[PDB]
Design a protein around this nucleic acid. Structure first.
Ligand SMILES: [Mg+2]
Ligand SMILES: [Mg+2]
Lengths: 57, 75, 144, 64, 143, 189, 145, 68
RNA sequence: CCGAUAACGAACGAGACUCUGGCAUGCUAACUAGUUACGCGACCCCCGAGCGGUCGGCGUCCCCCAACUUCUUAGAGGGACAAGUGGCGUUCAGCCACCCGAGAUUGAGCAAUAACAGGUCUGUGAUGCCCUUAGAUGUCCGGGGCUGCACGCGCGCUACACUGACUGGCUCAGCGUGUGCCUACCCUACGCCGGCAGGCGCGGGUAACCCGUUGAACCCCAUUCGUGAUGGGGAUCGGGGAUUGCAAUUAUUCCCCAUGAACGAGGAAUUCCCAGUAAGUGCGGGUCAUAAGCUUGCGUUGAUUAAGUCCCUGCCCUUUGUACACACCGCC
């Protein structure tokens, strides 16, 4: 998972963008669920412009 | 202060008092005359327009919620 | 004789109640919704309607015919819309038909007594939020 | 033997007092004697220049 | 001397015209007028015995202001406040039959006629009578 | 000239002490035909001072659920009350109202958060604005208390309250509470 | 005319099996009788042709019994059939109206009818619970504590 | 009160003055038209705030040595 | 934010942003919106007014056979920025008052890093694991109950009255909705019967066209009641009539006639709130075959108090002490 996320983030930044963030949540490693966030570049969260600036999947 | 058992119909002992002193003071209103004469108040309202018909008491307001009368001009 | 095209239609709005004062040249006459100014529903607040003609005299209204239509709001908002319409139509009439020196010396009389006769009230209402029964009041919460 | 009721005029506003702001503390001067001046505390909103009554001669004055 | 019902108090006008209909015995009064209530929301019977005349006067004055209004429009106008007992109060309309019979009787004197579309309006005869009655109440109010 | 309710001009009234002339608005500049004006007086501090006192009383006369927006009923109540006091006294109602305000304003009060002896521990003189506000509020509350359950009406209760406060009788609720507040403040000076 | 009280004015009146107050208006004084309601009074007086503006005690002796028989015999004076109480009678089908302790014993007659047939409503009435299906979770505790 | 500007409007105002000082004066209505062509400002509510701080700075730059 | 500054160069959040409200007699426009004027009428007024008054009566996109967009609708734009003056300020960032202005602080949405063993596997054909799977925890049908009542608490609705109740007249709003893929079920004008809920026949409307000029409530004006648990209150309960459905009993709801109970402003305590605000009065929508004492957006009438504070309850930053780090509901 951690290698794949780094590869995906590298591909996204190489395609050309101001920033990207990926969040993976679930039963990683042990039974206790843990969430991993890999964020880089500029990344807004608030206001109207986020709708036509970020793509959420 | 338990009950007031006011008068719904005049007896002579109240009507004679009505004839002389009711048209003798400025602020004559149904509530004031009711508390002065121990009358019901609907009777006061009726007698007040009877005194208006007699014409010795003037009206000022004629309102649905506050009717106000007065004595005649003297001096 | 029959000089035409001397008339204005000036609106007055107050709390969603808008009133248009059709000011027309003619005999001194005032009517709203086809009804005389005195022959009107709010006998208690009749003085507010009489206020502009009281402060300006029927002499300034001699060549003035006013027909006011209202199609919105409540009752007292309707009153305020009507009186603001009368005042605004009169000042517009004096502005665009005679000298604005006269228009100014009639404007200042209104503005020195009641500025609402010339400027509408910005307040209308406020949105009610989903936190309580009112715009700002909240539902009574308890802890036990 | 009884002190008569007198009036004093506010000069300048100092600030609030009473650990809630429920009373404002202001400096006042006597209209009877302009040179005569004290500082008092008053409840309710006060702006400068207004004149307020005073039943008592001198009550309290503290440096916060 | 032009007198219009809109130029005087309507509340005095309805009394004035109710007096006219009271003295002019042409109203087709049904037999249950002493029993029913004017509205579903109204708890108590009317106090005045001439309430039918008053309703006829009021609806004549309303048809003067605007025509074409049917019985549904009449009962919507004459609706009021239902206290709903312990439930929060609401709005309710009046009795349809009372307004229907008042309107029907208004054809009897031939001052209200049905329209080409829905509802009924005033005849020119009624338009004459309304302002004719308005003239005397205006004269009384002035003097 | 203004003829409030068509009569009772504000030209003939005066304020006996200069401590209240700045706030009472019975002057010709603050003279109004009718005590009903949406003046937005609550939008800023000290803006209610220039508001007419009659309008202030009209606003403050509605309380306790039943009356919270019935301004027209309040205006008719004030009109009838002023007519009644004019009948009972023979002079201008506005002067009676102003005198009632002056004789009802409590010149001192008391307030503390520390451990008070009886009610409040430190006595403090009030502002003139608080004087006027408490006078109007006390008059309204006294009229309402008098008329809570009895045959008398609001206009007449307001009338007797104003007359008692204007003359000074120690019988009006407003002046009674005024004397009580002054006595407690005097005890806890 | 706001005249004086007549000498033959009764401050209370004995009607049927109860008493009313002559000090109040007639149309609400007669409502003191069990079974006689406000609308029922305001229709029987209109059909019995009296003046509403007068009080109770100055009704004449013949007028009292005239009102009594008017209320007691509503069918034969154009009172609408839908204005009564015991309409479409549970026992004898007659559209009658009862305005006395006859109403009380008729109500008890229906109550014991329900008890004898041991219906749901009868059992609920006998136990003192609610009968119309309203919730008893948080109300009706005054009758117990 | 509550009318303190942010670096977003402060940085832009300083830059445009020292790039276009010969085209600016002490009139806000003039400057707000000046800022239109020299900068693509996405917001009407921003261009006038940008111009307003310029006039505040233009008063001071004509008097003394401002940091710009 | 200015400033200093072992920091520099940055980024997120706040802000900036989007929606609404507030001025736009400026523009574009309008028979699914109107306004003025004209011509017919209809009535009043006629002594005589005669451009007298009213008309939500009829016409002027019945295609040549009036103009206009103010009022109505919605786009493009503008307008407000501490812009100007005076005062305070390191005269820096900024603060106060005031003129002119519609507005000199309109409300919302969005909303960082990180975390909670906070809630939902009863939203999903989101799902691991476990359970069951034919006498089933699948699935259908009949019935019951989820409402059940010695008792306690929470959110609410109506009340205690006269600033009222009732009766009659007068009279003004805005959100938003209306006939169906399955899916049956719309919003209602008018006319007649009945008192009523309702019934019948005719329409309009898939919609600024019809309901609907949304003739609402409160409020306003007149009448009666008259301080009496009373004409305040309408709880419980008897009987009768309709509506919904296959089905109303444990009353779906609604109408009418019956009784009028506790309640006379409610402790110890406690909630929310600064202007169109609270509060009174509402209207729609949601659930709906029938349904609102609930909730949600919008209207109407409309305040007293205050432009401060750490006193209680909490929060933010710095310093400080720590034997706490499951973090003071700690440890001991
Ligand atoms: Mg009775
Ligand atoms: Mg933000």
């Amino acid at each position: 998972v951690r290698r794949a996320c780094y590869g995906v983030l590298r591909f996204i930044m190489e395609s050309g963008a101001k920033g990207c963030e990926v969040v993976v949540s679930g039963k990683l490693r042990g039974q206790r669920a843990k969430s991993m966030k890999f964020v880089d570049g500029l990344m807004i969260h608030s206001g109207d412009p986020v709708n036509y600036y970020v793509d959420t999947a | 202060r338990d009950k007031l058992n006011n008068l719904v119909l005049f007896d002579k002992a109240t009507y004679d008092k009505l004839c002389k002193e009711v048209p003798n003071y400025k602020l004559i209103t149904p509530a004031v005359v009711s508390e002065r004469l121990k009358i019901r108040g609907s009777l006061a309202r009726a007698a007040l327009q009877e005194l208006l018909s007699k014409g010795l008491i003037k009206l000022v307001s004629k309102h649905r919620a506050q009717v106000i009368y007065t004595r005649n001009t003297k001096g | 004789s029959k000089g035409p095209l001397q008339s204005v239609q000036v609106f007055g709005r107050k709390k969603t109640a808008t009133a248009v004062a059709h000011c027309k040249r003619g005999n001194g006459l005032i009517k709203v919704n086809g009804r005389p100014l005195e022959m009107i529903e709010p006998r208690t607040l009749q003085y507010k309607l009489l206020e502009p003609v009281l402060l300006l005299g029927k002499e300034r209204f001699a060549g003035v015919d006013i027909r006011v239509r209202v199609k919105g709001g409540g009752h007292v908002a309707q009153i305020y819309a009507i009186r603001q319409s009368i005042s605004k139509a009169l000042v517009a009439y004096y502005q665009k038909y005679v000298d604005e020196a006269s228009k100014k010396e009639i404007k200042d009389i209104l503005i020195q007594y009641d500025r609402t006769l010339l400027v509408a009230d910005p307040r209308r209402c406020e949105s009610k939020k989903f936190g309580g029964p009112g715009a700002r009041a909240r539902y009574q919460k308890s802890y036990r | 033997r009884v002190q008569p009721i007198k009036l004093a005029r506010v000069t300048k506003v100092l600030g609030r007092t009473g650990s809630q702001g429920q009373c404002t503390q202001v400096r006042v001067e006597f209209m009877d004697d302009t040179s005569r001046s004290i500082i008092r505390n008053v409840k309710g909103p006060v702006r400068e220049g207004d004149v307020l009554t005073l039943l008592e001669s001198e009550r309290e004055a503290r440096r916060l | 001397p032009g007198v219009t019902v809109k130029d005087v108090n309507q509340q005095e006008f309805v009394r004035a015209l109710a007096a006219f209909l009271k003295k002019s015995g042409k109203l087709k009064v049904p037999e249950w007028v002493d029993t029913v209530k004017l509205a579903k929301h109204k708890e108590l019977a009317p106090y005045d015995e001439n309430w039918f005349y008053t309703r006829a006067a009021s609806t004549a004055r309303h048809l003067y202001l605007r025509g074409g209004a049917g019985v549904g429009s009449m009962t919507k106008i004459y609706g009021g406040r239902q206290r709903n007992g312990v439930m929060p109060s609401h709005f309710s309309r009046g009795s349809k039959s009372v307004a229907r019979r008042v309107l029907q009787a208004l054809e009897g004197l031939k001052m209200v006629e049905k329209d080409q579309d829905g509802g009924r309006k005033l005849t020119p005869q009624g338009q004459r009578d309304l302002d004719r009655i308005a003239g005397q109440v205006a004269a009384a109010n002035k003097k | 000239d203004i003829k409030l309710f068509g009569k009772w001009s504000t030209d003939d009234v005066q304020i006996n002490d200069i401590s209240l002339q700045d706030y009472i608005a019975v002057k010709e500049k603050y003279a109004k035909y009718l005590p009903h004006s949406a003046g937005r007086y609550a939008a800023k501090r000290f803006r209610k001072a220039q508001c007419p006192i009659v309008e202030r009383l009209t606003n403050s006369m509605m309380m306790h659920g039943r009356n919270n927006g019935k301004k027209l009923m309040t205006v008719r109540i004030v009109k009838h009350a002023f007519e009644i006091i004019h009948l009972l006294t023979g002079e201008n109602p506005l002067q009676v109202l102003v005198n009632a305000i002056i004789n009802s304003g409590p010149r001192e009060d008391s307030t503390r958060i520390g451990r008070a002896g009886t009610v409040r521990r430190q006595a403090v003189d009030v502002s003139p604005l608080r004087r006027v506000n408490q006078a109007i509020w006390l008059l309204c509350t006294g009229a309402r208390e008098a008329a809570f359950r009895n045959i008398k009406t609001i206009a007449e209760c307001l009338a007797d309250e104003l007359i008692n406060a204007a003359k000074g009788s120690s019988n009006s609720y407003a002046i009674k509470k005024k004397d009580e507040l002054e006595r407690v403040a005097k005890s806890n000076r | 005319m706001s005249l004086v009280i007549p000498e033959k004015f009764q401050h209370i009146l004995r009607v049927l099996n109860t008493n009313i107050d002559g000090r109040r208006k007639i149309a609400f004084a007669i409502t003191a009788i069990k079974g006689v309601g406000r609308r029922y009074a305001h229709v029987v007086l209109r059909k019995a042709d009296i003046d509403l503006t007068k009080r109770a005690g100055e009704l004449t002796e013949d007028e009292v019994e005239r009102v009594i028989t008017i209320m007691q015999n509503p069918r034969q004076y154009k009172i609408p059939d839908w204005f009564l109480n015991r309409q479409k009678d549970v026992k004898d089908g007659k559209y009658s109206q009862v305005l006395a302790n006859g109403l009380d014993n008729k109500l008890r007659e229906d109550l014991e009818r329900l008890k004898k047939i041991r219906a749901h409503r009868g059992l609920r009435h006998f136990w003192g619970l609610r009968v119309r299906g309203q919730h008893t979770k948080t109300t009706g505790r005054r009758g117990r504590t | 009160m509550g009318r303190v500007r942010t670096k977003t409007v402060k940085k832009a105002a300083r830059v445009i003055i020292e790039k276009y000082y010969t085209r600016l004066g002490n009139d806000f209505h003039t400057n707000k038209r000046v800022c239109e062509e020299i900068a693509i400002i996405p917001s009407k509510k921003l261009r006038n705030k940008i111009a307003g701080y310029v006039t505040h700075l233009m008063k001071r730059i004509q008097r003394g040595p401002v940091r710009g």
